[PDB]
């Protein structure tokens, strides 16, 4: 099946907890995969304009590890719950992708999670201005704008709203699309 095939692909790239004990300032992100209309999508947030770091930018759910977290995956799930109401029973964490090093002292660990078909986002307005889906296949043929660095523009055909996706967020989306969608029969 589509979902079993995605999970099998994702598992081959799982680094596990290899890098997780290293003494960094630690953040986790959840790359939430949603199946709608026979296709996989990624769920993104738009960060509230109130937030000090990167207000109004497109981001994956996630945030800073805290002492309650049993592990890095727990960080991602806690933060996703806080931001979009995703409950742990509504997500299956399939793997841990390559961590992202930033600012010399920070390590961001991404987890890919399969999201339950009955999940409905409940954006928490103190953290998140918007939640939206992008079909995973979009990231194979994105609409690219150069601002000099590359920015994706995605227009939701449901409402015509255009979102700009960039940076680590755009990078991770492409990675996940390659992993899951490369070399598939039609
Ligand atoms: C320092 O670099 C990063 C650290 C954390 C994150 C993830 C994140 O904070 N996501 C979020 C938070 C609030 C609302 N929506 C999404 C991304 C980059």
Query: Rounded to an integer, what distance in angstroms lies between the CA atom of residue 14 and that of residue 154?
Result: 28
Asked if residues 35 and 2 have their Cβ atoms less than 8 Å apart, the reply is yes
Asked if residues 26 and 107 have their Cβ atoms less than 8 Å apart, the reply is yes
Record the resolution, in angstroms.
1.9
- Indicate which technique resolved this structure: X-ray
Q: What residues does each domain of the chain span?
A: 1-186
Query: Rounded to an integer, what distance in angstroms lies between the CA atom of residue 170 and that of residue 80?
Result: 18
- Taking the centre of ligand 1 as the mean of its atom positions, its distance from the CA of residue 30, in whole angstroms, is 10
Query: Rounded to an integer, what distance in angstroms lies between the CA atom of residue 160 and that of residue 108?
Result: 32
Ligand 1 pocket, residue 142 CB under 6 Å: no
Tokens of 68: 């309650």
Ligand 1 pocket, residue 45 CB under 6 Å: yes
3-state secondary structure of 94: strand
- Give CB contacts under 8 A, 24+ apart, made by 140-145: 140/177, 140/178, 140/181, 142/170, 142/174
């Amino acid at each position: 099946s589509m979902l079993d095939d995605a999970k099998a692909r994702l598992r081959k790239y799982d680094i596990g907890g290899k890098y997780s004990h290293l003494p960094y300032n630690k953040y986790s992100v959840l790359l939430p995969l949603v199946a709608k209309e026979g296709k996989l999508h990624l769920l993104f947030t738009v960060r509230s304009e109130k937030l000090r770091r990167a207000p109004g930018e497109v981001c994956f759910p996630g945030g800073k590890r805290d002492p309650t977290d049993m592990d890095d995956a727990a960080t991602a799930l806690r933060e996703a719950q806080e931001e979009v109401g995703l409950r742990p029973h509504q997500v299956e964490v399939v793997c841990c992708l390559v961590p992202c090093l930033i600012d010399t002292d920070t390590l961001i660990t991404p987890f890919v999670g399969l999201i339950d078909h009955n999940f409905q986002a409940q954006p928490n307005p103190a953290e998140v201005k918007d939640v939206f889906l992008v079909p995973l296949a979009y990231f194979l043929h994105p609409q690219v704008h150069d601002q000099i660095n590359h920015i994706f523009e995605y227009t939701n055909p449901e409402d015509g709203v255009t979102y700009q996706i960039k940076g680590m967020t755009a990078n991770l989306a492409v990675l996940v699309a390659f992993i899951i969608l490369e070399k598939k029969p039609t």
